[PDB]
Design a protein around this nucleic acid. Structure first.
Length: 194
RNA sequence: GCGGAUUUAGCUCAGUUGGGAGAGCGCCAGACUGAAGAUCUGGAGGUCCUGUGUUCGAUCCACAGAAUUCGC
């Protein structure tokens, strides 16, 4: 059995269990012995570093990120997605938005889960103008949102007293999801009677 | 036309709360035997039907299509 295969199996259990420390240790042990690190290994690595709840692997996540580009292993879509999760954990939604701008330069098509960290991060910060900048990027990427993303765009426009954006974000909300969750449903009728 | 079931090795089929899937038979070799069956050991053998998705990761989860099949 190859040491590169042995590394993947035990890295798999790290992501299954959440063992950030064993993932970080297995990676340095694999790097000391010159084990070839795959794109699969790096993304499982950046995944456990991006898990949120304080994290030890939060600061290491970018050290590992810088190592794969200098190792010149080709990134995936999950690479910049998990990289964007790292950026928003350090309270930098602009960087998470910069990660989804880089993937398009590599010919990588973003998915809905790629815009999550930047969109939700900009909405928590309150900056609606940057939230719309993310949403505009999605519609140009032909990535259609769903209720968590649309309700986030809904609230931030209500929080900034932006009645026009509330109306046409609600429009798309009415064509995309038919059964709206209770949390978002109450949010809409509170603003409609206000 | 409608609804359900099935799709995994050359054949019959397992396996399931997701992290390189096996069995039985067959095929080839070993072993054994004068020789052969049998018994036993090993090996080769896969687009896990197709597309789109969810996921860090899909044979397994979602949707659609195709084929097979049962009832209307």
């Amino acid at each position: 059995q190859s040491p590169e295969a042995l590394l993947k199996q035990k890295l798999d259990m790290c992501s299954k269990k959440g063992d950030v420390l064993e993932a970080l240790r297995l990676y340095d042990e694999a790097r000391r012995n010159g084990v070839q690190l795959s794109q699969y290994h790096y993304n499982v690595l950046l995944y456990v570093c991006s898990l949120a709840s304080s994290n030890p692997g939060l600061s290491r996540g970018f050290d590992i990120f810088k190592q794969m580009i200098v190792d010149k292993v080709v990134p995936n879509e999950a690479t910049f997605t998990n990289g964007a999760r790292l950026a928003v954990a350090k309270d930098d939604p602009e960087m998470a938005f910069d990660m989804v701008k880089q993937m398009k330069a590599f010919g990588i098509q973003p998915r809905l889960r790629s815009y999550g960290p930047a969109l939700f991060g900009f909405c928590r910060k309150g900056d609606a103008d940057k939230a719309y900048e993310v949403d505009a990027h999605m519609v140009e990427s032909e990535v259609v949102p769903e209720e968590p993303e649309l309700a986030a765009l809904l609230k931030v426009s209500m929080d900034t007293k932006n009645a026009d954006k509330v109306n046409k974000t609600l429009q798309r909300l009415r064509d995309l999801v038919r059964q709206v969750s209770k949390s978002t449903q109450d949010m809409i009728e509170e603003w409609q009677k206000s």
